[PDB]
Automatic annotation (TrEMBL):
This is ABC-type uncharacterized transport system periplasmic component-like protein. The lineage of its organism: Bacteria, Pseudomonadati, Rhodothermota, Rhodothermia, Rhodothermales. The chain holds residues 27 to 181 of 185 of the full protein. Keywords: Signal.
Length: 149
């Protein structure tokens, strides 16, 4: 129930001065009609550039993720849902491990991701945080939100 705009504003609070964020998006997910335009409106509202790399199958996850880094110098990974491809354990573990190795936190759609090393997720608005990863990534939670841990 936390909307993409609400999510991005929270990211903005968590990483002041963030300029560019990368999304890996399942081409085949539902509400693609709803969500991609929400992402553009959230980008506009926050001033954070949202670069979307779409993926249709597992073999596309590694090269599309690396495009976000090669071509767009993104500062974090943001995953919006997990109904299909992004619900596959292989896709999830690849993304978290590679984001982490690259130095960037992952903002995720469910707590399963946090258990595997993602940084933050949401519930309705309350943050849910993997404090060990936040601490290592230099991310301070605002006292005002101080959250499920």
């Amino acid at each position: 129930e936390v909307t993409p705009i609400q999510q991005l504003f929270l990211i903005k609070e968590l990483k002041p001065g963030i300029a560019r964020i990368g999304v890996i998006w399942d081409k085949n997910a539902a509400n693609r009609d709803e969500v991609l335009p929400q992402l553009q409106r959230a980008s506009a509202a926050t001033g954070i550039k949202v670069v979307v790399a779409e993926v249709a199958s597992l073999q596309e996850v590694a090269p599309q993720f690396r495009t976000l880094l090669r071509d767009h110098q993104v500062e974090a990974l943001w995953v919006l849902e997990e109904s299909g491809l992004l619900g596959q354990a292989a896709a999830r573990s690849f993304l978290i491990k590679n984001a982490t190795q690259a130095g960037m936190p992952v903002f995720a759609p469910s707590e399963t991701w946090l258990k595997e090393g993602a940084c933050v997720t949401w519930r309705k608005i309350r943050l849910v945080v993997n404090k060990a990863v936040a601490e290592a990534m230099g991310i301070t939670i605002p006292a005002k939100y101080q959250t499920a841990f």
